[PDB]
Amino acid sequence: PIKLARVTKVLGRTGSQGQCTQVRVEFMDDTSRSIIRNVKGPVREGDVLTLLESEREARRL
Amino acid sequence: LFYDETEARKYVRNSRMIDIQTRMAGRALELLYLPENKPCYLLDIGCGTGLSGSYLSDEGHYWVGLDISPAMLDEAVDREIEGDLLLGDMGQGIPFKPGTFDGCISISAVQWLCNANKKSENPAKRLYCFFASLFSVLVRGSRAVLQLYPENSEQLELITTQATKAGFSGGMVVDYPNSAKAKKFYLCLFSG
Amino acid sequence: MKLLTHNLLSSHVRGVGSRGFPLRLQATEVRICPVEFNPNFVARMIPKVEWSAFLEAADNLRLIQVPKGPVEGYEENEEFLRTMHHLLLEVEVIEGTLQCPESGRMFPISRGIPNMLL
RNA sequence: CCUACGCCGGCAGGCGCGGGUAACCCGUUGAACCCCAUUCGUGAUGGGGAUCGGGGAUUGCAAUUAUUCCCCAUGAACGAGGAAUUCCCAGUAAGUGCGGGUCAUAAGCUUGCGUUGAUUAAGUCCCUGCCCUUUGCACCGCGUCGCUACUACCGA
RNA sequence: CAAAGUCUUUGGGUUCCGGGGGGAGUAUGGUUGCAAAGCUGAAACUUAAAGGAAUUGACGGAAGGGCACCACCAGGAGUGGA
């Protein structure tokens, strides 16, 4: 399901050329499930993404 | 997917594309010692619109062409080809019985096996599946010459390693190698 | 899709392979296209043809006008060689089907390309 | 030799008449794109003008292998370009013209200037390179024959 | 290394045994053993090194960092097509 989600941060630029900006993710369903994901392109602190799904997450370890 | 009707047409109708593809096909045929000075049956792999396949017909060869693009095949239909055109992904295998073809030729196409977009097997698996099936569908002592565009030396080594493991022997011919604008890599192989 | 190509084509299913040849053939449409006659090429095709599979694909396409086993010679019998050229090189399937009898799948031939995808 | 102004040239150019040995005179350096109207209407067409045939005028000892410029006529390829690859962070790239320079004419070359004005990101070590730090050919499972000559064996 | 010391300032008694490296522990003979093999044990020829301790700088197919649009990414203009 379509999930809109708050941006908390920008951890690094993962990838091979500095191309996946690293984003801690709050949800907008008021749940504190703060999954850290990867985006492509510029995101500043306090933005809001459209996660296509919350099951598939970015790499921990 | 990469080509459409518009782009397939613009590629096949470009005089500069025609001339370069014709030169590389004739160079591949010169390197192909098994059809060179012999009649043969051939498989053209990544046949596109049949620019390489027409030049096989010029030397009197009978051929089957494999391509993954409908629009490249549809443009080939209107060019009075004598070969059989087949819609097919070379990375899934070569779908002929053992010992069918004297030789195989490919012009500008096998570097796409390093690409991981079309299917969800690894390029490494598809590359093995291509070379192992290609070895099988060839006669004993049959030849394969592939002009290809590698992005780097790791891609060249990976292609060489997969061909080696499949049972091929031979090497790499690099024409004009001091011009990285005009240099061309030809993989030249033979089966057991 | 020349008839000869039938003998060099098999089902792409990994489980049918390497038992997946020959495919059983039906043609909704056919054509004859003029091709140069080469007896030497026809005679040099014989040693690369699976003859048993050749007869079966001809039978499927409604033809028993074929020798029981492979043939041999100096190419001076134009009768049998012209009939082989007519069949192998000149008859083309435009529209038709290719059924594998082991996986059950039916592939199509359409203007005039055989397609071997899932 | 830079030109203004006037006269004569359908177009390149002549003829008379000054300033300027120079932020002055050319010079207010009066430009191109741009804009507003007109015509064309998606095709090898009026796009592209190459490729040439007739002339005309300058530069010069000397234009024939077209010096250059102008005026008719000619109108090919080219339908957004494959493999690969160059340059690119804000008055930037790109569109677009103006002056210097070998200099008799010679200018798609080079050397600045202005005008119109963008996209994208402000990251990284994968590819390309570049700079530092640390660290230290033993061996095993290529062969067949032929006739003649020569060395060393065994020997009826 | 407390003996691998008291050794050119060379002598306490006494047994075995080594003379470049290969050829070689092969031959051949004797001897023991049921046998495999053990003990003793050559030479022809070939080669200028084989070896023993310790001792240092280039390449890494070794690893980390760091920079650059004469690198990439996102993209623009393209060239390469006539």
The domain limits of chain A are 1-61
- Of B110, B99, B170, B177, which is closest to residue B146 (Cα–Cα)? B110
- Is residue B64 classed as helix, strand or coil in its secondary structure? strand
Question: In the complex, which nucleotide's C1' lies nearest to the CA atom of residue B20?
Answer: D82
The method of structure determination was: cryo-EM
B14 Cβ nearer than 7 Å to chain E strand: yes
Q: Among residues B158, B149, B100, which one has the least CA distance to residue B125? A: B158
- Strand D closer than 7 A to residue A21 Cβ: yes
> CA dist A30 to A2, A4, A27, B114, C65, Å?
15, 11, 6, 44, 78
By Cβ distance, the residue of C8, C44, C117 closest to B96 is: C8
Closest by CA position to B77, among listed B168, B169, B8, B180: B8
| Beta-carbon contacts of residue B151 (< 8 Å; ≥ 6 apart) | B111, B114
Q: Tell me how far apart the alpha carbons of residues A20 and A12 are, in angstroms, rounded to a whole number.
A: 8
Question: Protein C61 CA to nucleic acid D2 C1', in Å?
Answer: 93
Look up residue B67 and give its amino acid: D
The one-character DSSP state at C2 is B
* ω into C22 cis (within 30 of 0): yes
Site from C49, C52, C113, C118 to mutate, B interface, most B CB atoms within 10 angstroms: C113
Mutation test of the interface with chain B: which of C1, C8, C107, choosing the one with the most B Cβ atoms within 10 A? C8
* Burial (CB count <10 Å: 0-12, 13-18, 19+), residue C93: buried
Mapping DSSP to helix (H, G, I), strand (E, B) and coil, where does residue C79 land? helix
Q: Which residues pair with C93 in a beta bridge?
A: C30
Cis bond before residue B60 (omega within 30° of 0): no
Choose among A27, A22, A20, A23: nearest CA to A6.
A27
Superfamily covering domain A1-61: Nucleic acid-binding proteins (2.40.50.140)
Nearest to B23 by CA among B188, B139, B186, B190: B186
Q: Helix crossing, B51-58 with B15-31: angle to 10°?
A: 50
DSSP state of C23: P
Separation of alpha carbons C39 and B131, rounded Å: 33
Helices (H), chain B: 5-13, 15-31, 51-58, 70-77, 123-137, 153-166
The alpha carbons of chain C give a radius of gyration, in whole angstroms, of 15
Structure tokens at C57: 């694909």
Handedness of CA B17, B144, C112, C92 (dihedral sign): positive
Q: For tokens 């039938």, what's the residue?
A: C6
- Whether any strand D atom is under 7 angstroms from the Cβ of B179: the reply reads no
Enclosing H/E stretch for C52:
helix C51-60
B56-73 CB burial, b ≥16 within 10 A, e <16: bbeeebbbbbbbbbbbbb
Is the C-alpha dihedral spanning B13, B17, B23, B26 positive or negative? negative
Q: Does C94 touch chain B (CB under 8 A)?
A: no
Q: Using DSSP, state whether C9 is helix, strand or coil.
A: coil
Q: Which residues of C touch B96 (CB under 8 A)?
A: 8-10
**Which residues, including other chains, have CB under 8 Å from residue C20's CB and lie 6 or more apart?**
C10, C11, C12, C13, C100, C102, C103
Contact C98, C23 (CB under 8 A): yes
The span from the CA of C113 to the CA of C118, in Å, is 15
Q: Which residues contact A30 (CB under 8 A, 6 or more apart)?
A: none
Q: Which 1-60 residues of chain A approach strand E with CB closer than 7 Å?
A: 16-17, 19, 41
Residue B8 has phi, psi (to 5 degrees) of -60, -45
Other Cβ atoms less than 10 A from the Cβ of C3: the count is: 23
Beta bridge partners of A35: A25
Pairing of strands A48-51, A35-39: unpaired
Distance (Å, whole) CA B185 – CA B148: 6
Residue nearest to nucleotide D83 (CA to C1'): B149
